Amino acid sequence: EACVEPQITPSYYTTSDAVISTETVFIVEISLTCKNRVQNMALYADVSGKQFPVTRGQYQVSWSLDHKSAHAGTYEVRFFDEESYSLLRKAQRNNEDVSVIPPLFTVSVDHRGTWNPWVSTEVLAAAIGLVIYYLAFSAKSHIQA
Amino acid sequence: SADTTILFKGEDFPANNIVKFLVGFTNKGTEDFIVESLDASFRYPQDYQFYIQNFTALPLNTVVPPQRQATFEYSFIPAEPMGGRPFGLVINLNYKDLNGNVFQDAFNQTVTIIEREDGLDGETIFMYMFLAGLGLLVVVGLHQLLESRKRKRPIQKV
Amino acid sequence: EEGARLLASKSLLNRYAVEGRDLTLQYNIYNVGSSAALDVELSDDSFPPEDFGIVSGMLNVKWDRIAPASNVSHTVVLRPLKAGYFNFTSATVTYLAQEDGPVVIGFTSAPGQGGILAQREHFLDWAAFGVMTLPSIGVPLLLWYSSKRKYD
């Protein structure tokens, strides 16, 4: 539980085409198989002061935010065990910092390159019809001269 | 570990919001329960006798031994606007034996939503309506102002 | 103590990422209950064999673990064969709950069809299709400019 071997495998998420599509969830897979026997207990993930609902682990941090408001991959997410979460539940009302409670460990995430494309990948196909306006202008000229 | 519980997270339901319910029933009976079908549909709260809307119910035929539970999900989106009116949501265990008859062993729940807009694009329709009303009132006002201004002192008009 | 079980629905994210892109099906879990589930089953029963190929033949994955330690596999690599119309039929995700035993038959089927044309002869496809005809773009303009230079 001390993260003796900090396994850090970072991979990003496609997040579809967040500019046009609505499935805008940035869920980066930072795999962390540390020297721990974490099992049958909800290892709580506090990232930017927000406690993510942890299911089967999550190690995949999922910020379900719009791309315009989630163009960030670097995050310090603190993993707290059951006792640390219980202590935090009482310490938070006391205006105590996240780092003044005995934690389990911490993870640093770096996934710069958020959202990676063009806004419209299909409407530009219809723009090929604009080239026929040149021959239409030529036909108008033929009508004229 | 876990026990029987039915839930729906967050009460921020916009207009015509889709509400989902998940139910897991711990079977306290003396025998394994084989639920053939489940009852779930929205209707008029005061008069539940008539079926104004029949919500789709997928057959499940779930089998659970006693003191265990199974989880099932449903999702209903009110086509007609609604607010501040719970519906039935009655839980009926349809367990049948080799005899071929089902014995009804039946609580209620709540549902509510705040209505602002609806349609393919409700916001643009409401904005267009507001703009049309503003334009008609403004054009009437300016017509009256032009009629009044292009005269003498409007005191002998009476 | 609560529900919020598996909800691994297959969404129509991109339908076009890169040339020769292999679909990376991912499964999402959101549960807060303190209990655990056993005997996971991942079956690719409803998949298009003509346009998508499964890595490990007929995928039948059993995990039977609820732990933040790790998971067997949730990144299904569907390898396409050739360009065309691909349908995201469904992905079978059942659970043989050790508490009860019978199969929790759940598979999210969606009518999501997407078109990816020939990459070489959407964006790359249509761009290559448009730029295929070179003479029709330049030769009339070449003649127009020749006439202009002869007349101006």
Q: What is the 3-state secondary structure (H, E, C) of chain B?
A: CCCCEEECCCCCCCCCCCEEEEEEEECCCCCCEEECCCCCCCCCCCCCCCCCCCCCCCCCCEEECCCCEEEEEEEECCCCCCCCCCCCCCCCEEEECCCCCEEEECCCCCCCCCCCCCCCCHHHHHHHHHHHHHHHHHHHHHHHHHHHHCCCCCCCCC
Cβ contacts below 8 Å, chain A against chain C, sum to 62
Interatomic CA distance for residues B134 and B132, integer angstroms: 5
What is the resolution of the experimental data for this entry, in Å? 2.7
Contact C68 A39 (CB under 8 A): yes
Question: Which neighbouring-strand residues pair with A26?
Answer: A63
Q: Is C151 on the interface with A (CB under 8 A)?
A: no
B111: closest CA among B81, B144, B149, B154?
Answer: B81
Interatomic CA distance for residues B39 and B60, integer angstroms: 11
Smallest CA–CA separation between C100 and chain B, in Å?
Answer: 5
Collapsing DSSP states into helix, strand and coil, what is residue C125?
helix
Interatomic CA distance for residues A30 and A75, integer angstroms: 11
Contact A56 C66 (CB under 8 A): yes
A-chain CB neighbours of C34 within 8 Å are 42
A30: closest CA among A73, A68, A91, A94?
Answer: A73
Collapsing DSSP states into helix, strand and coil, what is residue C30?
coil
C71-86 CB burial, b ≥16 within 10 A, e <16: beebebebebeebeeb
A31-50 CB burial, b ≥16 within 10 A, e <16: ebebebebeeebbbbbbeee
C14, C71, C130 ranked by CB distance to A14: nearest: C14
- Residue C73's alpha-carbon distances to A10, B15, C11, C26, C97, in angstroms, are 17, 39, 19, 9, 19
Collapsing DSSP states into helix, strand and coil, what is residue C106?
coil
Kindly list the partner chains of chain A, i.e. chains with 3 or more CB atom pairs below 8 Å.
C
A40, A53, A118 ranked by CB distance to C67: nearest: A40
Question: Which neighbouring-strand residues pair with C115?
Answer: C85
Cβ contacts below 8 Å, chain B against chain C, sum to 48
**Probe site for chain C from B9, B71, B75, B91 (most C CB atoms < 10 A):** B71
Tokens representing residue B93 in the block: 């265990």
8-state DSSP, A127: G
Instruction: Tell me the pairing of strands A75-80 and A60-63.
Output: unpaired
Which residues, 6+ apart, have CB-to-CB distance to C70 below 8 Å?
A: A33, A57
Which residues, 6+ apart, have CB-to-CB distance to B118 below 8 Å?
A: B15, B16, B81
Give the nearest chain A residue to C6 (CA atoms): A55
Kindly give the residue spans of alpha helices, DSSP state H, lying in chain C: 123-130, 135-151
Contact C3 B62 (CB under 8 A): no
B-chain CB neighbours of C33 within 8 Å are 2
Question: Which neighbouring-strand residues pair with A106?
Answer: A78
B-chain CB neighbours of C35 within 8 Å are 1-2
Contact C68 A124 (CB under 8 A): no
Scanning C45-104 for CB atoms below 8 A from B yields: 97, 99-102, 104
Tokens representing residue A69 in the block: 């408001």
C-chain CB neighbours of B70 within 8 Å are 97, 99-100, 102, 104
Q: Is A56 on the interface with C (CB under 8 A)?
A: yes
**Probe site for chain B from C7, C29, C99 (most B CB atoms < 10 A):** C99
Interatomic CA distance for residues A137 and C147, integer angstroms: 17
Interatomic CA distance for residues C31 and B14, integer angstroms: 24
Beta-carbon-side half-sphere exposure of residue A19 (alpha carbons within 13 Å): 8
- Residue C83's alpha-carbon distances to A86, A131, B25, C51, C53, in angstroms, are 54, 27, 47, 8, 13
Smallest CA–CA separation between C50 and chain A, in Å?
Answer: 24
Tokens representing residue C33 in the block: 């209950």
Residue located via tokens 């103590």: C1
Tokens representing residue C43 in the block: 């079956």
A10-24 CB burial, b ≥16 within 10 A, e <16: eebbbbbbbeeeeeb
Q: What is the 3-state secondary structure (H, E, C) of A55-101?
A: CCCCCEEEECCCHHHCCCCCEEEEEECHHHHHHHHHHHHHCCCHHHC
Interatomic CA distance for residues C27 and C72, integer angstroms: 12
Interatomic CA distance for residues C59 and C55, integer angstroms: 8
Q: Report the sign of the C-alpha dihedral through residues C123, C124, C125, C126, in that order.
A: positive
Give the nearest chain A residue to C131 (CA atoms): A128
A-chain CB neighbours of C14 within 8 Å are 14, 16-17
Q: Is B3 on the interface with C (CB under 8 A)?
A: yes
Interatomic CA distance for residues A7 and A38, integer angstroms: 14
Interatomic CA distance for residues A45 and A22, integer angstroms: 25
B-chain CB neighbours of C8 within 8 Å are none
Number of H helices, E strands in chain A: 2, 7
Method used to determine the 3D structure: cryo-EM
Tokens representing residue A59 in the block: 């190690």
Interatomic CA distance for residues A19 and A68, integer angstroms: 9
- Residue C6's alpha-carbon distances to A9, A77, B9, B105, C59, in angstroms, are 25, 25, 15, 28, 18
Beta-carbon-side half-sphere exposure of residue A110 (alpha carbons within 13 Å): 3
Contact B7 C101 (CB under 8 A): no
B-chain CB neighbours of C99 within 8 Å are 64, 68-70
Interatomic CA distance for residues B57 and B148, integer angstroms: 66
B-chain CB neighbours of C4 within 8 Å are 7, 22
The answer to whether residues A26 and A70 touch, using CB atoms and an 8 Å cutoff, is: yes
- Residue A85's alpha-carbon distances to A37, A54, C69, in angstroms, are 17, 12, 18
Q: Is A59 on the interface with C (CB under 8 A)?
A: yes
- Residue B69's alpha-carbon distances to A28, B44, B104, in angstroms, are 34, 31, 19
C89-119 CB burial, b ≥16 within 10 A, e <16: bbbbbbbbbebbebebebbbeeeeeeebeee
